[PDB]
Amino acid sequence: MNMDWALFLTFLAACGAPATTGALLKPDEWYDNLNKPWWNPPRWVFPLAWTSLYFLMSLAAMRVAQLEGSGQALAFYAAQLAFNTLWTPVFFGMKRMATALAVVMVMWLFVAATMWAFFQLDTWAGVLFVPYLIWATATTGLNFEAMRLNWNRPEAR
Amino acid sequence: MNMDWALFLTFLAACGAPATTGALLKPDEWYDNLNKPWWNPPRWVFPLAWTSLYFLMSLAAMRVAQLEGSGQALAFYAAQLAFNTLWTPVFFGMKRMATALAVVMVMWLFVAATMWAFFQLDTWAGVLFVPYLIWATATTGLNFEAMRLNWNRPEAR
Ligand SMILES: C=CC1=C(C)c2cc3[nH]c(cc4nc(cc5[nH]c(cc1n2)c(C)c5C=C)C(C)=C4CCC(=O)O)c(CCC(=O)O)c3C
Numbered sequence: 661m662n663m664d665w666a667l668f669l670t671f672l673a674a675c676g677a678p679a680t681t682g683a684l685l686k687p688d689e690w691y692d693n694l695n696k697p698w699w700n701p702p703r704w705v706f707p708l709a710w711t712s713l714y715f716l717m718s719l720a721a722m723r724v725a726q727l728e729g730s731g732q733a734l735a736f737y738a739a740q741l742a743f744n745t746l747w748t749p750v751f752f753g754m755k756r757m758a759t760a761l762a763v764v765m766v767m768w769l770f771v772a773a774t775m776w777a778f779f780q781l782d783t784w785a786g787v788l789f790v791p792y793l794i795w796a797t798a799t800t801g802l803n804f805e806a807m808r809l810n811w812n813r814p815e816a817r
Numbered sequence: 818m819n820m821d822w823a824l825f826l827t828f829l830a831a832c833g834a835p836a837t838t839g840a841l842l843k844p845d846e847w848y849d850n851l852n853k854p855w856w857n858p859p860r861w862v863f864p865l866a867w868t869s870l871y872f873l874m875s876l877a878a879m880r881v882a883q884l885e886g887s888g889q890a891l892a893f894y895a896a897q898l899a900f901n902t903l904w905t906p907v908f909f910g911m912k913r914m915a916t917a918l919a920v921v922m923v924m925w926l927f928v929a930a931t932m933w934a935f936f937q938l939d940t941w942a943g944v945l946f947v948p949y950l951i952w953a954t955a956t957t958g959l960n961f962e963a964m965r966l967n968w969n970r971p972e973a974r
Pocket residue numbers: 678679680681682683684685686703704706707708710711744745748799
């Protein structure tokens with residue numbers, strides 16, 4: 661088991677895809693006007709938490725990918741990253757809060773699944789995913805509350 | 818080497834994240850009005866091309882993920898899939914064409930890298946990414962020609 665830099669930089673580069681979704685956001689008065697739970701962090705917290713988790717999940721996948729029988733784990737990981745990349749555009753871009761809520765739940769389930777598979781192969785890779793899963797749970801709660809506490813128009817069918 | 822239905826259905830399900838980008842953002846009226854290159858294919862072509870490629874890439878990844886030392890190849894697979902998911906919301910959603918070109922070029926590099934890495938472990942998995950790399954090369958040209966042939970629109974530059 662090593663710090664393998666070809667693996668870790670490949671997974672890190674991969675997190676460049678969700679990274680662009682967040683960067684390409686402007687200040688948005690639609691989001692500024694939303695009612696929000698008291699525990700909603702300020703917007704500057706999110707790039708730093710997401711950045712940290714990009715490093716933690718890339719370090720976790722890096723370990724797992726040096727181990728035998730890791731295919732199912734890395735299938736869960738590919739699915740996790742892909743629905744994570746899809747959420748931000750759906751919520752902030754298209755402003756479809758219901759559809760984004762379905763998305764972040766499919767994400768949460770694949771994050772939990774990865775973490776679990778990771779735990780069957782490597783406790784540290786599993787442990788590295790725990791703050792991801794927590795952050796994903798809060799993200800689900802935030803999307804859910806944005807929809808509970810606000811007016812939603814109908815989405816394009 | 819087998820038909821692993823859990824592996825395959827996981828990779829296919831991960832393809833649900835990109836498949837969702839098209840469903841929510843079908844080619845726009847704004848997209849119709851862009852000047853297109855002469856070889857631009859009709860509009861029914863793209864849903865059947867992407868749908869085939871999700872089955873083909875999921876099948877390829879399923880073979881590879883059963884093999885030993887497939888970590889790096891699976892790492893490339895997560896990388897291409899994420900940049901794939903990111904591309905449609907950048908080009909069709911935000912209409913930021915120049916950023917989209919960067920995105921689809923990075924995607925192309927990671928599709929080439931997955932293919933190459935698939936060939937090192939399983940010849941069939943490599944063969945099945947061949948039409949993907951071909952199609953990603955066509956996607957890249959379309960994105961380039963969309964900017965080239967619509968350079969007077971601010972969203973192209
Ligand atoms: C430009 C304006 C930016 C805003 C409003 C911002 C704020 C946000 N970023 C979010 C997600 C995010 N923040 C993120 C990394 C970055 N974000 C960045 C720029 C921004 N980050 C930069 C730069 C990043 C990398 C260096 C990413 C990548 C997401 C999308 C979640 C994900 O896919 O990782 C969310 C949704 C909550 C969550 O992640 O749970 C908010 C409110």
